[PDB]
């Protein structure tokens, strides 16, 4: 069902995460970690302290899809062999994340969702780190195919 999912998403904040390659999202799905540029690191840390759940929704550039979404379980902390586009010293710290859905979603399926915080452009459109408004972000997550391998019981207890 979708009920535990909706509970996790209740009053969450949402951020669009753009990756230049699939290898970095694969690493993040395997290791439960993410790292971003300091400008986005600061925004995510602020949001982590501010809300019950901070959701990162991942899209690989030029893939035409989202690759899933995850919940921040920590602030950033200061090695991961990211495929950098840019040096490793340029990155901020590492966030721990818990995946909520590792399934992909094609942009064609979110064409009816616009993001008020990016001029009501379709939610697929945005820079890395763009915040997605609550209602748009919730509906986007509900569009993903259910990931029956994930048990949100252990995510709920971290809220």
From Swiss-Prot:
Domain remark text: The YTH domain mediates RNA-binding.
Species: Homo sapiens
Domain of life: Eukaryota
Record PTM Phosphoserine, positions in chain: 87
Effect of residue 127 to D: Does not affect ability to influence alternative splice site selection
Quaternary structure and partners: Interacts with SRSF1. Interacts with SRSF2. Interacts with SRSF3. Interacts with SRSF7. Interacts with SRSF10. Interacts with CPSF6. Interacts with KHDRBS1/SAM68. Interacts with TRA2B. Interacts with KHDRBS3. Interacts with EMD. Interacts with RBMX. Interacts with ZCCHC8.
Residues of the full protein shown: 345 to 507 of 727
Reported impact of residue 56 to E: Does not affect ability to influence alternative splice site selection
Protein name per the record: YTH domain-containing protein 1
């Amino acid at each position: 069902g979708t009920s535990k999912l909706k509970y996790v998403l209740q009053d969450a904040r949402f951020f669009l995460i753009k990756s230049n390659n699939h290898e970095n999202v694969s690493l993040a799905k395997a290791k439960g970690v993410w790292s971003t540029l300091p400008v986005n690191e600061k925004k995510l840390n602020l949001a982590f302290r501010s809300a019950r759940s901070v959701i990162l929704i991942f899209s690989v550039r030029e893939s035409g899809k989202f690759q899933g979404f995850a919940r921040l379980s920590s602030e950033s902390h200061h090695p991961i062999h990211w495929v950098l586009p840019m040096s490793a010293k340029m990155l901020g710290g590492v966030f721990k994340i818990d995946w909520i859905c590792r399934r992909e979603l094609p942009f064609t399926k979110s064409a009816h969702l616009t993001n008020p915080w990016n001029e009501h452009k379709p939610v697929k459109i945005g820079r890395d780190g763009q915040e997605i408004e609550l209602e748009c972000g919730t509906q986007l997550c509900l569009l993903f195919p259910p990931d029956e391998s994930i048990d949100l019981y252990q995510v709920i207890h971290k809220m």
